[PDB]
């Protein structure tokens, strides 16, 4: 690696900086707010009574969490369909408001609840606009509605049978003027009687047995969403380099116990430059502290290609209880500037050859090995100072020394258009 970075086939004695290392992340943890109050959906899809098709019940559901997985993965409903979005993703979708329309119809009419459909139900009873529909669910009512004896209790707004000519076999018209009277409309002397009935006889046949149909529509972009689905929950891990979203805000680091105290309305603390430092988890309502995962450049101490072919590896500024040859086997020495492997530590002290940092350096100079020692500031002596003693030299020497100084460098001219 040193030869690669330097781009040469030979290297001299010294310390070189080749690359850097970074502790890789681990398993992830995902969190959200603790619990949301469940709306009473069983009063809608599993009520004891329903409404007629010409007076289908409409209700509003909002400001809670909706779990569509339980009603979607349970095969207790005859017909299940959804438009625009796959049902399995409704547990991860957010909407403004939800509208539920419930009624009871015959078995054959269940196919007529869709945008762009036609019929007695579509034109007079349940007018679905030509737009995306949330989800249509239907189930057989022969077990509770018809079998108990309710074979005539449902009425349907067909038409007035008043102002149509024989255009085809079925005399069906859209001119429904009357019907405001709660007595199915009075045509003076009961000339016309709209709102015919259903023959929900259980033994007549499954073709027109009672069927409960509920249609769910969702309000989009009219206001910020208030209803969402059940979100996936997992546990937490400590003292590991972990990536997370942790109830909304992403982050990679190591968790630890914290000492900070929050006011009852904060969410997370920081120090500077939008760097989160402490966070609180809604499920546990506890504060934890975040520390960035360790990293740093590596370095190689080498005595030169000529002398030997062995090197020592120094990791900078990392407590190397877990760094992972020169990964775990070789001898380790923890300094104030990281830790080094491949070189032994002796207690002696000599002159300094290859500087490292924190007052120590490594070489082989005072057997075919690299030793790291604490440098010595020099020799040691004490001069016997006394108030009536002097020392006078008696001989002299003349010495010649050399000093070197640069005074110039090359003159280079570069064109602008040419380059």
């Amino acid at each position: 690696e040193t030869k690669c970075t330097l781009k040469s086939f030979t290297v001299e004695k010294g310390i070189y900086q080749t690359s850097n290392f970074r502790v890789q992340p681990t398993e992830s943890i995902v969190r959200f707010p603790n619990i949301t109050n469940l709306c009473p959906f069983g009063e809608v899809f599993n009520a004891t009574r329903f409404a007629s098709v010409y007076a289908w019940n409409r209700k509003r559901i909002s400001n809670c969490v909706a779990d569509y997985s339980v009603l979607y993965n349970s095969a207790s409903f005859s017909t299940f369909k959804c438009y625009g979005v796959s049902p399995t993703k409704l547990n991860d979708l957010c909407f403004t408001n939800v509208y539920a329309d419930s009624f009871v119809i015959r078995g054959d009419e269940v196919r007529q609840i869709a945008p762009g459909q036609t019929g007695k139900i579509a034109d007079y009873n349940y007018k679905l606009p030509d737009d995306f529909t949330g989800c249509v669910i239907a189930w057989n009512s022969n077990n509770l509605d018809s079998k108990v004896g309710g074979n005539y209790n449902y009425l349907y707004r067909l038409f007035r049978k008043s102002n149509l000519k024989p255009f085809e076999r079925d005399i069906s018209t859209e001119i429904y003027q009357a019907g405001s009277t709660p007595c199915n409309g009075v045509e003076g002397f009961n000339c016309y009687f709209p709102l015919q009935s259903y023959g929900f006889q259980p033994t007549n046949g499954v073709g027109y047995q009672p069927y409960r149909v509920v249609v769910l529509s969702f309000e989009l972009l009219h206001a910020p969403a208030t209803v969402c689905g059940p979100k996936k929950s997992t546990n937490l891990v400590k003292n590991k380099c972990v990536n997370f979203n942790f109830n909304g805000l992403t982050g990679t680091g190591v968790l630890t116990e914290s000492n900070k105290k929050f006011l009852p309305f904060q969410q997370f603390g920081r120090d500077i430059a939008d760097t989160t430092d402490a966070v609180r988890d809604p499920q546990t309502l506890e504060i934890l502290d975040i520390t960035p995962c360790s990293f740093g450049g590596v370095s190689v101490i080498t005595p030169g290609t000529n002398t030997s072919n062995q090197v020592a590896v120094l990791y900078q500024g990392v407590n190397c209880t877990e760094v992972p040859v020169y990964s775990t086997g070789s001898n380790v020495f923890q300094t104030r500037a990281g830790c080094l492997i491949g070189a032994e530590h002796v207690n002696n002290s000599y002159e300094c050859d290859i500087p490292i940092g924190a007052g120590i350096c490594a070489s082989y100079q005072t057997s075919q090995s690299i030793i790291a020692y604490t440098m010595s500031l020099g020799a040691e002596n004490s001069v016997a100072y006394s108030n009536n003693s002097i020392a006078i030299p008696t001989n002299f020497t003349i010495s010649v020394t050399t000093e070197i100084l640069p005074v110039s460098m090359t003159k280079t001219s570069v064109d602008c258009t040419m380059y």
Binding site: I272, G357, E380, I390
Partner: protein, 271 residues
Amino acid sequence: ICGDSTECSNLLLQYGSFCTQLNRALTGIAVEQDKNTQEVFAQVKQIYKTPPIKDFGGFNFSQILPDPSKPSKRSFIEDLLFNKVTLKFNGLTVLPPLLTDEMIAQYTSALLAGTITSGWTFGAGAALQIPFAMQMAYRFNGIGVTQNVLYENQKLIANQFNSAIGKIQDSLSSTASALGKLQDVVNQNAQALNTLVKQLSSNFGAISSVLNDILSRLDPPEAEVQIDRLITGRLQSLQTYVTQQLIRAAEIRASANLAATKMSECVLGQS
């Protein structure tokens, strides 16, 4: 400038080999600072020790000499100076100096003991012992006042010296704001690094300053343009920071050279 993202590295690898230039410049200036400290302080080839018993003709050096009571063996003025002035997130690391503080203190103590006991003879060879009064006589001869003056006024000069050193100790202890230059250097370094790390969260004309979201919300055809804008902005900021650091390093080099000249001339001799 990538924040652990693969496509960011894929885009970045086509801009050239500028990172080698940046790392080379920073390593060069760091090595130069190490050489600066080494050339300023490493001026003696021994470590002298003052005799246990002290009688310097009446002078009193107790406030200047190192104290064995302190574990760091630092004198009173050193403690006052250290207590007076007071000062690794996303790839911004700080390396420790080669010479720890204790070694610097030992160098200063050796220099001071050598200049007390021997005079200026240890700046040209082997240290030669000499009584203190007969050294002050030489230093008075050096400025034109005959040596006859000193020997007849020794007690008065000793009292003057002690009173002056007491007054300067009191002035340093009480009056602050006399150490402006070092505080300014530290503040400049910290402020430059802090504004560099503050620059990270600017929009730079892109859609957002968070890269993971901008990738997760878009597709390559325009995510390429957005990421390119962010990369070029961040690279320009980093280059500006490096240039400013180079200028400051040159200034500090000039100051350190002047300090080395003063230390070599006014301590190991007489100006």
